[PDB]
Design an enzyme around this catalytic site. Structure first.
Site, PDB file in Angstrom:
ATOM      1  N   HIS A  30      -3.856  -8.089  -1.305  1.00  0.00           N
ATOM      2  CA  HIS A  30      -4.301  -7.063  -0.563  1.00  0.00           C
ATOM      3  C   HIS A  30      -5.814  -6.803  -0.478  1.00  0.00           C
ATOM      4  CE1 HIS A  30      -2.955  -2.800   1.227  1.00  0.00           C
ATOM      5  NE2 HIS A  30      -3.805  -3.330   1.888  1.00  0.00           N
TER       6      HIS A  30
ATOM      7  N   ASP B 122       3.272  -5.296  10.060  1.00  0.00           N
ATOM      8  CA  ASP B 122       2.353  -5.326   8.855  1.00  0.00           C
ATOM      9  C   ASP B 122       2.698  -3.972   7.972  1.00  0.00           C
ATOM     10  OD1 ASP B 122      -0.049  -6.688   7.892  1.00  0.00           O
ATOM     11  OD2 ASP B 122      -0.490  -4.702   7.822  1.00  0.00           O
TER      12      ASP B 122
ATOM     13  N   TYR C 256       1.486   1.306   1.011  1.00  0.00           N
ATOM     14  CA  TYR C 256       1.663   2.122   2.439  1.00  0.00           C
ATOM     15  C   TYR C 256       2.770   3.174   2.061  1.00  0.00           C
ATOM     16  CZ  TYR C 256      -1.243  -1.321   4.590  1.00  0.00           C
ATOM     17  OH  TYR C 256      -2.186  -2.226   5.003  1.00  0.00           O
TER      18      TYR C 256
ATOM     19  N   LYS D 215       2.121  -6.888   1.002  1.00  0.00           N
ATOM     20  CA  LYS D 215       0.935  -7.234   0.209  1.00  0.00           C
ATOM     21  C   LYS D 215       1.192  -6.662  -1.232  1.00  0.00           C
ATOM     22  CE  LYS D 215      -1.878  -6.022   4.481  1.00  0.00           C
ATOM     23  NZ  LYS D 215      -0.981  -4.980   5.064  1.00  0.00           N
TER      24      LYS D 215
HETATM   25  N1  LIG Z   1      -5.488  -5.302   4.568  1.00  0.00           N
HETATM   26  C1  LIG Z   1      -6.132  -4.177   4.653  1.00  0.00           C
HETATM   27  O1  LIG Z   1      -6.788  -3.759   3.475  1.00  0.00           O
HETATM   28  C2  LIG Z   1      -5.741  -3.133   5.670  1.00  0.00           C
HETATM   29  C3  LIG Z   1      -6.671  -1.904   5.691  1.00  0.00           C
HETATM   30  C4  LIG Z   1      -6.177  -1.032   6.954  1.00  0.00           C
HETATM   31  C5  LIG Z   1      -5.505  -1.354   7.751  1.00  0.00           C
HETATM   32  N2  LIG Z   1      -4.620  -2.260   7.555  1.00  0.00           N
HETATM   33  C6  LIG Z   1      -3.364  -2.613   8.476  1.00  0.00           C
HETATM   34  O2  LIG Z   1      -3.804  -2.510   9.777  1.00  0.00           O
HETATM   35  C7  LIG Z   1      -3.191  -1.558  10.632  1.00  0.00           C
HETATM   36  C8  LIG Z   1      -4.024  -1.041  11.640  1.00  0.00           C
HETATM   37  O3  LIG Z   1      -5.156  -0.610  11.086  1.00  0.00           O
HETATM   38  P1  LIG Z   1      -5.621   1.003  11.228  1.00  0.00           P
HETATM   39  O4  LIG Z   1      -4.229   1.570  10.593  1.00  0.00           O
HETATM   40  O5  LIG Z   1      -6.800   1.353  10.547  1.00  0.00           O
HETATM   41  O6  LIG Z   1      -5.731   1.332  12.638  1.00  0.00           O
HETATM   42  P2  LIG Z   1      -6.224   1.027  14.027  1.00  0.00           P
HETATM   43  O7  LIG Z   1      -5.168  -0.052  14.399  1.00  0.00           O
HETATM   44  O8  LIG Z   1      -7.574   0.577  14.091  1.00  0.00           O
HETATM   45  O9  LIG Z   1      -5.721   2.305  14.557  1.00  0.00           O
HETATM   46  C9  LIG Z   1      -6.310   3.085  15.477  1.00  0.00           C
HETATM   47  C10 LIG Z   1      -6.085   4.413  15.526  1.00  0.00           C
HETATM   48  O10 LIG Z   1      -6.108   4.216  17.005  1.00  0.00           O
HETATM   49  C11 LIG Z   1      -5.101   5.030  17.726  1.00  0.00           C
HETATM   50  N3  LIG Z   1      -4.645   4.407  18.762  1.00  0.00           N
HETATM   51  C12 LIG Z   1      -3.685   3.212  18.660  1.00  0.00           C
HETATM   52  N4  LIG Z   1      -3.538   2.868  19.922  1.00  0.00           N
HETATM   53  C13 LIG Z   1      -4.254   3.632  20.833  1.00  0.00           C
HETATM   54  C14 LIG Z   1      -4.522   3.528  22.307  1.00  0.00           C
HETATM   55  N5  LIG Z   1      -3.868   2.649  23.174  1.00  0.00           N
HETATM   56  N6  LIG Z   1      -5.280   4.414  22.689  1.00  0.00           N
HETATM   57  C15 LIG Z   1      -5.944   5.354  21.842  1.00  0.00           C
HETATM   58  N7  LIG Z   1      -5.603   5.203  20.610  1.00  0.00           N
HETATM   59  C16 LIG Z   1      -4.762   4.388  19.967  1.00  0.00           C
HETATM   60  C17 LIG Z   1      -3.937   5.390  16.621  1.00  0.00           C
HETATM   61  O11 LIG Z   1      -3.799   6.780  16.862  1.00  0.00           O
HETATM   62  P3  LIG Z   1      -2.162   7.103  17.244  1.00  0.00           P
HETATM   63  O12 LIG Z   1      -1.313   6.923  15.859  1.00  0.00           O
HETATM   64  O13 LIG Z   1      -2.081   8.732  17.267  1.00  0.00           O
HETATM   65  O14 LIG Z   1      -1.754   6.503  18.328  1.00  0.00           O
HETATM   66  C18 LIG Z   1      -4.627   4.992  15.278  1.00  0.00           C
HETATM   67  O15 LIG Z   1      -4.524   5.951  14.419  1.00  0.00           O
HETATM   68  C19 LIG Z   1      -2.781  -0.531   9.612  1.00  0.00           C
HETATM   69  O16 LIG Z   1      -1.629   0.272  10.010  1.00  0.00           O
HETATM   70  C20 LIG Z   1      -2.361  -1.544   8.408  1.00  0.00           C
HETATM   71  O17 LIG Z   1      -1.072  -2.133   8.827  1.00  0.00           O
HETATM   72  C21 LIG Z   1      -4.708  -3.056   6.628  1.00  0.00           C
HETATM   73  C1  LIG Z   2     -11.524   0.835   7.967  1.00  0.00           C
HETATM   74  O1  LIG Z   2     -11.223   0.439   6.606  1.00  0.00           O
HETATM   75  C2  LIG Z   2     -10.094   0.581   5.850  1.00  0.00           C
HETATM   76  C3  LIG Z   2      -9.847  -0.254   4.947  1.00  0.00           C
HETATM   77  C4  LIG Z   2      -8.715  -0.164   4.023  1.00  0.00           C
HETATM   78  C5  LIG Z   2      -7.860   1.217   4.242  1.00  0.00           C
HETATM   79  C6  LIG Z   2      -8.039   1.961   5.550  1.00  0.00           C
HETATM   80  C7  LIG Z   2      -9.277   1.720   6.146  1.00  0.00           C
HETATM   81  C8  LIG Z   2      -6.949   2.955   5.476  1.00  0.00           C
HETATM   82  C9  LIG Z   2      -6.761   4.056   6.434  1.00  0.00           C
HETATM   83  C10 LIG Z   2      -6.770   3.266   7.695  1.00  0.00           C
HETATM   84  O2  LIG Z   2      -5.943   2.170   7.792  1.00  0.00           O
HETATM   85  O3  LIG Z   2      -7.748   3.352   8.369  1.00  0.00           O
HETATM   86  C11 LIG Z   2      -5.948   2.363   4.123  1.00  0.00           C
HETATM   87  C12 LIG Z   2      -4.647   3.148   4.012  1.00  0.00           C
HETATM   88  N1  LIG Z   2      -6.841   1.144   3.690  1.00  0.00           N
HETATM   89  C13 LIG Z   2      -6.154   0.518   2.755  1.00  0.00           C
HETATM   90  O4  LIG Z   2      -4.817   0.385   2.774  1.00  0.00           O
HETATM   91  C14 LIG Z   2      -6.454   0.010   1.578  1.00  0.00           C
HETATM   92  C15 LIG Z   2      -6.347  -1.343   1.247  1.00  0.00           C
HETATM   93  C16 LIG Z   2      -6.857  -2.018   0.151  1.00  0.00           C
HETATM   94  C17 LIG Z   2      -7.818  -1.348  -0.699  1.00  0.00           C
HETATM   95 CL1  LIG Z   2      -8.998  -2.010  -2.088  1.00  0.00          CL
HETATM   96  C18 LIG Z   2      -8.168   0.067  -0.155  1.00  0.00           C
HETATM   97  C19 LIG Z   2      -7.660   0.629   0.910  1.00  0.00           C
END
Ligand SMILES: NC(=O)c1ccc[n+]([C@@H]2O[C@H](COP(=O)([O-])OP(=O)(O)OC[C@H]3O[C@@H](n4cnc5c(N)ncnc54)[C@H](OP(=O)(O)O)[C@@H]3O)[C@@H](O)[C@H]2O)c1
Ligand SMILES: COc1ccc2c(c1)c(CC(=O)O)c(C)n2C(=O)c1ccc(Cl)cc1
Length: 315
Positions: A112, A45, A50, A79
């Protein structure tokens, strides 16, 4: 390990999150994406926002070139950023993402966010009060442009992200709709489990994809440091001990058992390998009920900068 999408394509139910904050060197995305593929992740993803598509793309291409995977084995998402909602900007944005990643197609292209922003050079154009400068775009027109991207073969599938039920309904009710969104990628974890949205998506054969499933990276721009830390939750800890797993694994498995496709970001080699263990155990009905009890309407993304946007999805 895959779910069939409403357009006949297939999506791996565990995806690798590639976002890391700007303070992390760009080169790291290349290293960790290769590690993710080596560990068994096949759904990757990314996004224009990013600033990592070159690195993520190179990781994929490197694992294709050395024979570890074939392109058809990888499910790659990018996205459309919010300054490119105007329909004429959609295909060029996708073409740019493809050029960055050096790929011929993406498996999935998402809007997005529903929160359209002023077109231009800045990712986040903001007024003097710190609220992003909105744009009024009929997202049905954005969607028609996405459909044209699917028809051209630039994206195998198209979907949305951060849409609420009403917003998704508007697309689904569009006159002359060609393709439904295959998915809605949204913030989803035990503190904000999106039960009502999940039920709606299921009713329309739209996959809910969970981001911040492990409680987000808690970025200071958007996240209150007072907010409870998901992975420190006592119930998740107790379940981790009961199963001799980890709180992260409990949180991921929760989503799989609800029929939610789940992302997991890690830039740590040990945790990347740990996260694929989600397929090695199950939670009982009583475990799932305990986790359902944690729901508290806590969206970690919670800033003034977007809460005043006309299309802010949260109420
Ligand atoms: N569509 C959107 O608006 C949107 C918004 C936010 C995110 N996303 C996508 O979703 C992805 C994931 O969401 P997120 O980036 O917010 O993070 P998340 O998956 O909620 O990541 C959680 C944090 O947990 C830690 N972690 C991961 N595995 C672990 C484990 N096994 N034990 C303990 N800690 C652990 C990581 O730190 P470490 O790296 O130090 O392991 C990470 O910083 C993003 O990278 C992105 O691709 C999309
Ligand atoms: C937990 O709620 C969010 C939501 C969106 C996030 C993040 C965290 C972080 C940090 C993280 O992934 O935790 C990033 C980089 N976000 C975005 O990409 C993003 C996407 C669309 C908009 Cl309009 C604004 C921000």
């Amino acid at each position: 390990q895959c779910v069939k999408l409403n357009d006949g394509h297939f999506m791996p139910v565990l995806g690798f999150g590639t976002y890391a904050p700007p303070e992390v060197p760009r080169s790291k995305a290349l290293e960790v994406t290769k590690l993710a593929i080596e560990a068994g992740f096949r759904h990757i993803d990314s996004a224009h926002l990013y600033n990592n598509e070159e690195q993520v793309g190179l990781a994929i291409r490197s694992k294709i070139a050395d024979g570890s995977v074939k392109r058809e084995d990888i499910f790659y998402t990018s996205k459309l950023w919010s300054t490119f909602h105007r329909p004429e900007l959609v295909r060029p944005a996708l073409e740019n993402s493809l050029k960055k990643a050096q790929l011929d197609y993406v498996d999935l292209y998402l809007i997005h966010s529903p929160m359209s922003l002023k077109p231009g050079e800045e990712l986040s154009p903001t007024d003097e009060n710190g609220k992003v400068i909105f744009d009024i775009v009929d997202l049905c027109t954005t969607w028609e442009a996405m459909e044209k991207c699917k028809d051209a073969g630039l994206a195998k599938s198209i979907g949305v992200s951060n849409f609420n039920r009403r917003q998704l309904e508007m697309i689904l009710n569009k006159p002359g709709l060609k393709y439904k969104p295959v998915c809605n990628q949204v913030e989803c974890h035990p503190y904000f489990n999106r039960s009502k949205l999940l039920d709606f998506c299921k009713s329309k054969d739209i996959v809910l994809v969970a981001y911040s499933a492990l409680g987000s990276q808690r970025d200071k721009r958007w996240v209150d440091p007072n907010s409870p830390v998901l992975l420190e939750d006592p119930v998740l800890c107790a379940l981790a001990k009961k199963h001799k797993r980890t709180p992260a694994l409990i949180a991921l498995r929760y989503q799989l058992q609800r029929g939610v496709v789940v992302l997991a970001k890690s830039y740590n080699e040990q945790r990347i390998r740990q996260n694929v263990q989600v397929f090695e155990f199950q939670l009982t009905a009583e475990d799932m009920k305990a986790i359902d009890g944690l729901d508290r309407n806590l969206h970690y993304f919670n800033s003034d900068s977007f809460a005043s946007h006309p299309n802010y999805p949260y109420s």
